[PDB]
Ligand binder design. Structure first.
Ligand SMILES: CN1CCCN(c2nc(C(F)(F)F)nc3ccccc23)CC1
Ligand SMILES: CN1CCCN(c2nc(C(F)(F)F)nc3ccccc23)CC1
Ligand SMILES: [Cu+2]
Ligand SMILES: [Cu+2]
Ligand SMILES: [Zn+2]
Ligand SMILES: [Zn+2]
Lengths: 153, 153
């Protein structure tokens, strides 16, 4: 079993804690936790390439995309490794995160440890938005909070 | 070449940016940067085992020690992989960091990506101190600032 963790922080109200667990090296990764301070509705949720927070979340670069694919949602074949869809917040301003993914990993070439998890301003259109930007970022807006994904006990 | 980066944050502000570069995986890692907000003198400087900052720097656990060795200085054979010695601050509250190390790595089972870099309250005695604790922590005191080590562009 391997485990990872990420503390999400930014310049405004948004903060969270996200845990990762992978029972077997070729198996799915369970992703769970909570984020507070979010507006009601969908917020894009991605692994970005660099675990670099030098100048804030912008330093993390583009979506983690080792296979040079176009942007999509987690249930699509055509997706970046980092494409984890959206988390959804209620009027309480909290998103409960509960995700299983078979494309990210905590080892090998799809490994996300040392990279940056980011929660966005707006919805990810999952590459179905019909514009050029949909196929790169999913039009999810500014980066509200982020952290580096680290090895957990 | 592999590159990594770490943003150190803690109360003070104790704040720094530390860069890592390793030209080849069988080679040394160059470590450089700046830390501000430190009291004059030596401050212990270590890679700790977990990249977990859920409850602050205490969540990072003990020194990274994959080989089950005792604590030492960077030039000692008998050391933890995470043992990077001390950074020194002058009256202007800044430590200039400039370290080359052959034991840490940015890949393999001595890899430090996804773990936590910590700068401490007091001097590391490099395992040469009077006691039990010298062989475990180097007596370097509380954790002033830390961050998770991430992959850089
Ligand atoms: C350490 N574990 C075993 C794995 C199952 N866990 C979870 N997994 C999932 C998941 F990821 F969808 F499977 N969601 C959760 C939501 C809330 C609380 C725990 C969740 C986390 C608890
Ligand atoms: C363009 N480079 C190549 C990477 C190595 N660099 C550095 N290395 C080292 C080192 F790590 F000691 F070799 N010290 C530095 C001190 C100040 C500024 C830069 C330093 C940064 C300069
Ligand atoms: Cu994103
Ligand atoms: Cu330490
Ligand atoms: Zn994407
Ligand atoms: Zn040590």
């Amino acid at each position: 079993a391997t485990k990872a963790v990420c503390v999400l922080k930014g310049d405004g109200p948004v903060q969270g804690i996200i845990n990762f667990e992978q029972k077997e090296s070729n198996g799915p990764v369970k992703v769970w936790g909570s984020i507070k301070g979010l507006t009601e509705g969908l917020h894009g949720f991605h692994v970005h390439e660099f675990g670099d927070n030098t100048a804030g979340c912008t330093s993390a670069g583009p979506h983690f995309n080792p296979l040079s694919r176009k942007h999509g949602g987690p249930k699509d074949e055509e997706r970046h490794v980092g494409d984890l869809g959206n988390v959804t917040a209620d009027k309480d301003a909290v998103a409960d995160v509960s995700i299983e993914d078979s494309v990210i990993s905590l080892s090998g070439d799809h490994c996300i440890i040392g990279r940056t998890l980011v929660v966005h301003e707006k919805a990810d259109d999952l590459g179905k938005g019909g514009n050029e930007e949909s196929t790169k970022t999913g039009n999810a807006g500014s980066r509200l909070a982020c952290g580096v994904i680290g090895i957990a006990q």
